[PDB]
């Protein structure tokens, strides 16, 4: 997270770290949506041009963490993946359309002050909350600048951007399962997601019920915090039906 600030403790309890077994490295973020289900970006788990193709036995998830690196005894829980589900129409050739994936934990994580699931939005929550100018929140242990690692979970509040403006900021094709967020170059503020932030959640707090809703997934961007560039987010509500399917079918 570029131009972020250090998270408070238990500020983002759905935040998940996606961890590579051998070698040990941070891959990207993710989010807890239930005691068994974790939602990340698909391009974290699979990206052929880089011969990237993980499986249930290559990865680990770390939940309830704050320090990036330190093992947080009696706080963090680690879990093993039972099944991975990448979205069927995830296009990794052209623009990371439908960059979304689901992971089922072998065992159901227990909830603490440190571990707690996030809400997925329904139609009107998505329609009420997700509007240009409205700010959401992004979290991760990703890098501090476009190439630098953070000590602990980083957090930043980014305004949603008008679809026109997203489209005329790039040559890349902006499908309807994306939205973009970030500052304009003279909005005075700045900040973006960065490498190893992907899969991490973009959440907003409902002003009606004090609940947090994961509105987007950190997906892609042309660099990090580049002036006149924005960050792109998998539109979680658009993909709600697939999520619904994968959960109702696989994993009873």
């Amino acid at each position: 997270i570029v131009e972020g600030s250090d998270a408070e403790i238990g500020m983002s309890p759905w935040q998940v770290m996606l961890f590579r077994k051998s070698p040990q490295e941070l891959l990207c973020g993710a989010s807890l949506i239930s005691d068994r289900w974790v939602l990340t970006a698909a391009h974290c788990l699979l990206y052929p041009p880089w011969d990237k193709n993980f499986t249930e036995n290559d990865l680990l998830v770390r939940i309830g963490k704050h320090s990036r690196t330190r093992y947080e005894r009696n706080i963090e829980k680690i879990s093993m993946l039972e099944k991975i589900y990448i979205h069927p129409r995830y296009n990794w050739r052209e623009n990371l359309d439908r960059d979304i994936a689901l992971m089922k934990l072998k065992k159901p994580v227990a909830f603490s002050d440190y571990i707690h699931p996030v809400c997925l939005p329904d139609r009107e929550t998505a329609a009420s909350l997700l509007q240009a100018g409205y700010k959401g929140r992004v979290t991760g242990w990703g890098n501090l600048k476009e190439t630098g690692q953070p000590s602990v979970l980083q957090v930043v509040n980014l305004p949603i951007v008008e679809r026109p403006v997203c489209k005329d900021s790039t040559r890349i094709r902006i499908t309807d399962n994306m939205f973009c967020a970030g500052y304009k170059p003279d909005e005075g503020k700045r900040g973006d997601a960065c490498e190893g932030d992907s899969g991490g959640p973009f959440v907003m707090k409902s002003p009606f019920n004090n609940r947090w809703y994961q509105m987007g997934i950190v997906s892609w961007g042309e660099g990090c915090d580049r002036d006149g560039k924005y960050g792109f987010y998998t539109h979680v509500f658009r993909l709600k039906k697939w999520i619904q399917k994968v959960i109702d079918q696989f994993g009873e």
């Binding site: 040990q24 990237k52 790039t170 040559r171 490498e195 190893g196 932030d197 892609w220 042309e222």
Partner: peptide, 28 residues
């Protein structure tokens, strides 16, 4: 498991994101 291993690193590396490397973010 959760069973004091001390065989899990506390000094590793944030990997590399294809996500940040699209378009102008493409690297040489």
């Amino acid at each position: 498991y959760a069973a004091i291993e001390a065989s899990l690193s506390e000094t590793f590396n944030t990997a590399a994101d294809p996500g940040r490397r699209l378009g102008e973010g493409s690297k040489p």
